[PDB]
Write a protein that binds this DNA or RNA. Structure first.
Lengths: 46, 271, 93
RNA sequence: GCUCGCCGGAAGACCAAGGGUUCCUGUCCAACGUUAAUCGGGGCAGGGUGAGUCGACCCCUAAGGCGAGGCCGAAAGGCGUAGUCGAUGGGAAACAGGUUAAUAUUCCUGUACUUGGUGUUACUGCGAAGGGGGGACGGAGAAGGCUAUGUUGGCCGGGCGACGGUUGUCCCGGUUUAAGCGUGUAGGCUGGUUUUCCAGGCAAAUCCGGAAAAUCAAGGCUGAGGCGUGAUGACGAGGCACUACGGUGCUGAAGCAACAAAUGCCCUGCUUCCAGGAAAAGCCUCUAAGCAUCAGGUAACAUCAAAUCGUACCCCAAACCGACACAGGUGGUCAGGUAGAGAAUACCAAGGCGCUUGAGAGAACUCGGGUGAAGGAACUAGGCAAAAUGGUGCCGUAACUUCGGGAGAAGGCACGCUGAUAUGUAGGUGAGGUCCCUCGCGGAUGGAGCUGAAAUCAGUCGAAGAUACCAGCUGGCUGCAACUGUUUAUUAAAAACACAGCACUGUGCAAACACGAAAGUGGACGUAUACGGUGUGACGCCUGCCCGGUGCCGGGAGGUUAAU
RNA sequence: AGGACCGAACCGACUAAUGUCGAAAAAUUAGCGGAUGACUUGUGGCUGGGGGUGAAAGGCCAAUCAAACCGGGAGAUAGCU
């Protein structure tokens, strides 16, 4: 019963991290759609 | 060389080894080695372009001297070796000056022979020189297609190309496929067949031997579903189609060649 | 050379505790509280300048912040850096 | 606290990942805890994570990512050169003891070691993005040497036993010591040294590669381990003091041999096999531009520095992934005794637990088991499930066979303990002393001691000696698939898929083909003994007729026919 | 030597019972197959939606797959309830 979420902070940050978002045009627009909604935690960094 | 293996195990029952006992047992010559990472068939875009590739043993790359661009300098063979990147073997040769280079191993090239390239080469096998100094009718291998290009024809195990004619600046060559083809008289070529002519006689016995040469299984489009292959579907071994590749194009006889740039050199196409 | 304007900023407070008094008695170490930045060189010079003692070696460690809730809202105390400053022989005050 | 019981290749111990204070102390019992709770991984407060050497960081790179310029693309952007990042790999150095309520290779005691700086002194050619070396590499097998460790004996301390006996071949406990430093072993590999030259190592090289000549035959490298020092130190069963009755205080004897021994280490070795088994820095060396008296390099001293981050705790789980204090999942490391081939299994050690509702009762019925008269598949869709067989040695073993198999076919017999052969043998180990020498960690000896199976004979006990756990049911005919394998995560594991093998077919390399508006990439750093597609599916014997339809290959007499 | 044999770790999942508001949104118990290899596993990476990958089952692509999930077109449309 290997559940789907097997955590790893390295994989987490390289996939959904801030720098991961900011690398690409489409990700720089996820941070825009989150600053829009006014999210406290923009990305996964903690 | 060609030895049938005793059936002490199913999967050993049909193996036919090719045990050439003069290959240098041990490690290759380091300065002529380099990384060679398996691709998996995958390409630039990371998608499989060539199917049924991936796996098998890790194998280094042996920088083979194909140009053979050392003239006047005689070279002595010193080691016949096993190259996993070819079907032929290779032959570490040592020049008078002190350079070592792997070359394809011809049929009679044994450790101790002497060879040299350039127009002043003798026509004993293992020598390379332009197919303007080589006599018509001779058997040659490691043929170039453009002068200095490097050597692209007759490189497999036991494959050779014979200079059939010579119409001034060009040279007709009966390629191992049966097709004749003009090749500029300056295109260098090395004499005699290539070694390891028994290569074709191994039988591999089992599926794992296909595997560890980097060959993944090949599904028959008949077994697939209508979505995967043009063949496919049908409530139990139904075909009704003309045999086509997985991409619709017809196979079982359909000329896919279209070059129009090099067909001026193809004197007589293969048979 | 460390500027005294920084040396007067480094040290925060003496850390008083059972283990701190224990280290003082049986090992002549003054447990301290220093700023988070606080290189060991920073701390050693600050001690030798502001207490005028002779330090043999410093051994820092960063203490994390307890997640201390206050009522319903969740809280988080701050990280701080401890400094086990071992004096040679001289004295503490 | 005593007794009982459970795990003990784990249900113990240490980690990584992940978590994030759950760690320790005091304190409280509302809520949380499937019950009560004084207790807690709960609430509140305080404390606790100490590094030149252990990880990270850092240096170097793999796959891969990004990518100045560049090429391509309606725009976004795609690809990619230099370059730059990217461990899961490569790169310097610390161990033992003690100590905390909670940290320890971090603190303290002792004993080290590494890399840089900076002077000093003395010798001095130094100088890199560049050359060369090394780093640096597989699978399997076979041993031999040793160690971890264990067992026994000795030695030391203690006891002489609640019930027959227990001054003895008696019982109990201990019998530990590291890094480092110095030897340089069992071993493994290499032939050394010198002079001369050389179209090769993108220049240069005094280095590597090469050709010789001389000259010697040994030199060199690697290396477990052991041995000495480290260490007359620590540790040490216990004893004597006092009590928070929880440990601090002091002292502390012996501290050895033999045998067995690893899956650990020599071994990145050796032997072999084909499938032919990273890179790059660190390190060594060579010169270039440059200085060349300098600078810089070397060695001895002296001192300096070694930053920052992590360090508590769980980690096969109540702390991580599963909504839960969830019978699930989770990579690595260490692995004691007896019996055992064994990391199985049984019982135990160190250690840790009794799984967070109990108390009774002793209905039906359900679940997990034990036993069963006579019969023995009559059950049933079906011997489903149970039952049964189950080990080692020797004898023996059918059709068929592709000569390997089938086969552990089938079947039969023996098995405990005691004694003798032989107060323990064959074997293994191997002491002293005796020599011999290039004297060593040497060699021949030489057999004390230890260890020690197996067998034969005789006796003896039981219903039963493979006595428990553990541990094949067997045989006949037949369909299909050659076989091993893969398969529908979560109702289908098959005859399906794959396969080796066979054939047809395309493809001459700017290969076909595929991904791509393109560039480009794979194919392949391959070259027709290669590569793709399709079908069939080992092997043996073979694979017959039909070219009308459809497709493909070619042909050109004519008909028809687009843009123009 | 072996895609050899028996058999633990390890991987898998053939049968049966249980469980079926479960201890568990696929497990437990007892047996079962492979167990030096077409093996298994840790870390990191690459491939993406008419697309990927597929020893091929329409299998898998985050408990979702004959076309994922999220947001939008969007208050789709619904002679139907």
């Amino acid at each position: 019963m290997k559940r789907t979420f097997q955590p790893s902070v390295l994989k987490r940050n390289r996939s959904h991290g801030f720098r991961a978002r900011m690398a690409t045009k489409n990700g720089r627009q996820v941070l825009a759609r989150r600053r829009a909604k006014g999210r406290a935690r923009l990305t996964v960094s903690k | 060389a060609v030895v049938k293996c005793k059936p002490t195990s199913p999967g050993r029952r049909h193996v036919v080894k090719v045990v050439n006992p003069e290959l240098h047992k041990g490690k290759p010559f380091a300065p002529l080695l380099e990384k060679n990472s398996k691709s998996g068939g995958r390409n630039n875009n990371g998608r499989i372009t060539t199917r049924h590739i991936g796996g098998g043993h890790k194998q280094a790359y042996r920088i083979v001297d194909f140009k053979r661009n050392k003239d006047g300098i005689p070279a002595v063979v010193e080691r016949l070796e096993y190259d996993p990147n070819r079907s032929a073997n290779i032959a570490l040769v040592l020049y008078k000056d002190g350079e070592r280079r792997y070359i394809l191993a011809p049929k009679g090239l044994k450790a101790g022979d002497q060879i040299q390239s350039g127009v002043d080469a003798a026509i004993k096998p293992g020598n390379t020189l332009p197919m303007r100094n080589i006599p018509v009718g001779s058997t040659v291998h490691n043929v170039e297609m453009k002068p200095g290009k490097g050597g692209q024809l007759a490189r497999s195990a036991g494959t050779y190309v014979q200079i059939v004619a010579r119409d001034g600046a060009y040279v007709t060559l009966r390629l191992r496929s049966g097709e004749m083809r003009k090749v500029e008289a300056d295109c260098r070529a090395t004499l005699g067949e290539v070694g390891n002519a028994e290569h074709m006689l191994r039988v591999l016995g089992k599926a794992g031997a296909a595997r560890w040469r980097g060959v993944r299984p090949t599904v028959r489009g008949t077994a697939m579903n209508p979505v995967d292959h043009p063949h496919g579907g049908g409530e139990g071994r139904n075909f009704g189609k003309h045999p086509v590749t997985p991409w619709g194009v017809q196979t079982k006889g359909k000329k896919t060649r279209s070059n129009k740039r090099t067909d001026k050199f193809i004197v007589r196409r293969r048979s | 050379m460390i500027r005294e304007e920084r040396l007067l900023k480094v040290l925060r407070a003496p850390h008083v505790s059972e283990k701190a008094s224990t280290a003082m008695e049986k090992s002549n170490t003054i447990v301290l509280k220093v700023a988070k930045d606080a290189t060991k060189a920073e701390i050693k010079a600050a001690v030798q300048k502001l207490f005028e003692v002779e330090v043999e070696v410093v051994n820092t460690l960063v203490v994390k912040g307890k997640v201390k809730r206050h009522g319903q809202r969740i809280g988080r105390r701050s990280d701080w850096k401890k400094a086990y400053v071992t004096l040679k022989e001289g004295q503490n005050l």
